[PDB]
Structures are given as C-alpha cells and as structure tokens.
C-alpha cells in the first residue's frame, strides 16, 4: 500500500513554494556574512559550498549552509585509530600560512578556529539592518532571521588531496552507479568539519556532503532514470519518507530526550546502503514504493538492533556504536518505528 | 554473420602492443616541443589535449595542442555555421597574440606560421632520435613530423574557449534519449576548441574532447561494458566502419575519388546511428553483424542523399555537393555495396 505514502509526499511538496521566500532572506544574510568574513586574513578564501537553500522535510523555517575554506598543502594525522577524526598539520613552509594564529603547536586548533568564526559572525549580525538576526547559543553557528528562519552555518576546510586511506573501501557504488563514476567522484575534493571526538577538542571530521548530493541527484543505473514515464523510480521518495518518519517521531518525543542523538544523516547513510543492496532501477519501481519503503524501514531497524550502521565512505566508522548512542535509545526508536509500521504509520497524519 | 567481423577485430587488436613502443617515441618528442613552445610569449599557456593513446596505422599518431584564449568574441563567417573569425573582447591587460592580429581579427596564417617556425627550429635541436618535418599538404593536419623514419605525428593547434558554445550548436548533440539530458547539460558546460581551417583567416569549431567522452562512456546504463551481461558492440562497429573506409581508400589510392572521405565522416555517421538506437539492447554483442549492417546502411543513405550533418552543428552538411562531388559519393556507394554483397572481401587477410 503506497497510497498514504504518495499522499504524504504531496503534502510535503506543498511546502516547496514558501521555501523560496525564506531562502531569499537567508541568501541576503549569508552574502553579507561572506563579504565581512572575506575581510579577515584567515577567512579570505571563504566561500559558499553550493547545496542547501533544506535538511528537514517538515521545516521550511530551517536552512543549513556550509562555508568552504580552501587549505593548500595539508597533512592529516588520524586520531586514536578513529577512521574519521584527524589532526590538521601543514606540509610546506613558504609562504606564511594565514591560519598561523590558530596553530596550537604544529596542529591547527578547531576550537581557536571556530571561536574566531563565531566572533566575526556575532560582530557582523548586529551591523546587518535589512532583517532582525539573532545568534543562538552553543549546543557550529545557528542564526534566527526575523524570529522564524533558523540558519545552521558550518565551517569546512577544503582539501584537493587524495581521500584518506579509511575511505579506500567505502563508496561501494561500482555495481550500481559504475566504477567509472566512483573513480570520477574520488578525484573531487574532500572536506573537514571541526568535530571533537570522545573530549579531544583539536580534531576534524571528514565530510562528503558534496558527493552525497551528486549521488542523490544522479541516482540511477540508467543515465535517463527519472527523465521519462517508463523510467520513473522511488529512491528519492523513500529517503524523503524515512527522513520524515524520524522528524515526526523526534517531534513526538522531544520532551523524552532519547531520540536527540538520531539525525537525518543516520537515515541517509542507511538509505545509501539499501541503494548498494538494490543496484537495479527495476528494484525501485514507482509502483513498488510501499515495498521499497518497507525494505528501508527494515534495514534501518536491523542497524538499530545490531548496533551497526557503517559510514558510507568510511566502512570502519560505526555511527551506531554503543559509545555514540546507548542501547536503550536504539531500543526506544526500534519500539516506535515497529509500532508505526504495524499501525499503517499513524505519525504521518501530523501526530 | 559476425564471425569474420570478430576475426578482423582480433587481427586489429594484435597491433595494440607495438602502439605502446611507438607512443613512447612520440611522448618524448612532444614533451620536448611543448617545453620549447611554452618559452614564446604567444604560446605560453600551450598544453597537450591528449590523443596519443587510422585502425590500420600504428606508425601514425595525431596530437592536439590546446592554447587557452581569455575573452574572445566570435563572428560567424558567411553563414557557414562552423567557420568563425576570432576577435578579442576586453582591453586590459595586453594580449599575447597581438603580433598575429590582421586588424581586429586574429590571423590563422600568421599564428600557424610562427607555430610551424618554432617547431622547425626545435626539431633540429632535439637529440636521441631522428626527427624530420614533412611539407605542407592541408591546413587542418598542420605540422607533420617523422620520427626515426617510421612514425608520423600530425600536430594540430587549437584555441581553447571556456565560453558558452556558439548558437549553431544549440540544436546539436542529440544525446538526451541515449546518454540523458543531464549529461548533455554537463558536456556543454565544458570548453570548445577552434582549429585553423580556411578565406585564409577563419577558424573551425572542434569538439574532439566531447567525441572521446561520448565514446569512452557510451551506454544508456552507467555499467555498460563493465560486466558479461552488459557487453555491447558500439566501439566495434565504429572500428569496423573506420577499417572499411581505410581498406577501400588504400585499394583505390591511384584513382583519387575517395581522397575527400575521412574517418570523421564515418564517426559522425556512427554517432547518428547511436542517436537512432539509444538502447544498449540494440547494441548486443551477439547482434554485431546486424548492428554493423545498420551502420553500413545509414552511411550509404548519407552518400545517396548527399546529407551527413555534423553531430554538433546540425546545419553544417559534411556531404554537401560543394565539399564532395556526386560522382565520388556514387563511387564509394558502388564499392561499399559490392563489399556488403560479397561478405566483405576487403576485410580478409
Ligand atoms: O556530513 C556529515 C558527516 C557525518 C559523519 C559522522 C561520522 C563519521 C563521519 C561523518 N555526520 C553528519 N551528520 N550530519 N551531517 N553529517
Ligand atoms: O573535429 C573535427 C571537426 C570537423 C568539422 C567539419 C565540418 C564542420 C565542423 C567540424 N571535421 C573534422 N575532421 N577531423 N576532425 N574533425
Ligand atoms: O571487384 C569488383 C567490383 C564490382 C563492382 C560492381 C559495381 C560497381 C562497382 C564495383 N563488381 C565486381 N564483380 N567482380 N568483382 N568485382
Ligand atoms: Zn530515478
Ligand atoms: Zn558498451
């Protein structure tokens, strides 16, 4: 039964037009912040990474923006055999490095880097008069435009180097998107977002947000997938429904605090794993949406039970490790998803 | 019947290993010429566009030398949708090619002369191999070298423009139902080249790079020719069409009719057949004989009707009566039809 699923997708599609006006407010504020950030020597080569402007299917008043900063000849040192967290050290000596001010030894400080970023942003939001902009407290930088629109702003270092060795056996798209696409994609840059690891406040985590967008917007085995009536698939619709399932349950149990650790990234990672399992476009037929979404729900639940959700790019990194998410939280999310699946998804009818 | 076709392809595949040694000699000479060419102010940003990787000629290599030109303005010559005059848009800073300006227009002749002059000067200086420069024949194959008395290298100069493709290409590259519209959008965002081809002041459009991309990523499916269940015969049909023309051109070299026909005509016609048959199922390995017969058949229709449109410039007809006379197309038709009727005797060896 896909009827109620297709009904949800149409209701979600009705929020599309309002996202245009809201994006206009965000484009204004972000263009301003990038003009003022480019004035500082450190953040001179700062730019917009070119994806979002949504990241929450039930949130037109929520936008995510990424600010790329190209870093020239960098050396990475993997922190404590975590295949995702690294220390950013510099390789060349000439000429003087613009980020020298944030070096806490030979290692670039994430904390000192993000503090200056937060400081310049706090300073420039008071000077912008077009709209009312407030900066939200530490929980990278979240703004609130005209008391409605929230903007999550991330700083990401860009490296045009070859991807770290931890990614060598990841991105298993060879039997789905082809090995020739995998070769082309790995030649693209990689990003590092400042994220500390279990209290190491000097580490950076790998980011492949750009590759995830490429793979989602060119998602079929066939190059003409979703370009004609005979080749329409339900891949994107399954992801939208999985994302919405978690958002609705997270909203339902916001006062409980269990589901706070789960994100749309867990849903998206699990979705790419199901795409690797079902490489044929015939396995994603529009008529089979109900059955396709049930495999996605089912795979996601297996990851929760087995406490195993590997990062799509870093196979050895487990997003569902007991050290990251406690078993009782995964058991609560399992309980809730199973109830929903057993009662024809009541949480879809805004519950 | 594909047996004799598959046999020819295996014999052509046996020339592959010798092409490695020969390419080594060419990589040496070309890397030298590019190092010396980069010394001149005009040809500073010169680079190789990478063709050094005729199906019956391992002692014959073609190389393209790209040169990026910044803010160029094109003026279409006499409603030819392929020939253009190269002008420059901005004023600051001074243009490195100012020496070749024959008015506000960049001279092809003055540009190619300096190119031929630096190349003639550097072939005498380079050691460890005997290199001779062959005399003028055509404007498109611009400078021809002869390494160690065996290897011929055709060196072409091409201007690179990162601008949007001219309006004459707007309705070309009909790969939307085969390679997808999203690929067509990605491909058109790439640069375009202009090779000096004459009116001895014009430049012709070149999309050699797009032809290579389309040939090396040729299926509807992204995994086409990456597994036993997805092996196609597209490349093999092109290799056989190219070899059919080369063998007939050799046979009638003393007659002079087929001199105007090139592998580009065969390749253009092949891309038109790919547009007609967008499905990988239409190019099954088992159906090679039937696939090659459609290619032969389409090519013959173009010869009879005197109509072979450029794959990128629809309004440009490569088989125009003004380019190739009717009696020459009729001779090539006669010969191809005889070959097809007698199980291709020109193939066997
Ligand atoms: O782009 C990303 C990346 C990651 C991430 C987590 C663990 C290891 C590696 C990468 N998590 C994320 N959560 N939201 N976005 N997002
Ligand atoms: O790349 C090309 C392009 C052309 C060509 C001919 C007529 C109009 C436009 C372009 N002809 C060619 N012959 N060999 N290569 N090659
Ligand atoms: O080599 C040939 C060629 C032809 C032939 C016929 C019509 C037009 C052109 C060529 N016919 C032939 N009959 N025997 N040999 N043979
Ligand atoms: Zn699709
Ligand atoms: Zn193929």
Residue numbers in the entry:
A (entry chain A): 161 to 213, 217 to 302, 307 to 365, 370 to 522
B (entry chain B): 161 to 213, 219 to 363, 371 to 521
Publication passage describing the model:
Cyclic GMP-AMP synthase (cGAS) is the most recently identified member of the family of cytosolic DNA sensors. Cytosolic cGAS binds dsDNA and in the presence of ATP and GTP catalyzes the production of the recently characterized second messenger 2′, 3′- cyclic AMP-GMP (cGAMP) which then binds to Stimulator of Interferon Genes (STING). In humans, the binding of the cGAS product to STING causes a conformational change resulting in recruitment of TBK1, and interferon-inducible gene activation and interferon production via IRF3 phosphorylation and nuclear translocation. Activation of cGAS is important in host defense against pathogens, but uncontrolled activation of the cGAS pathway has been implicated in autoinflammatory disease.
Although DNA-binding compounds may indirectly inhibit cGAS activity, to our knowledge no inhibitor shown to bind directly to the cGAS active site has been reported. To discover cGAS active site inhibitors we used NMR screening of a fragment library and identified a compound that binds competitively with cGAMP.
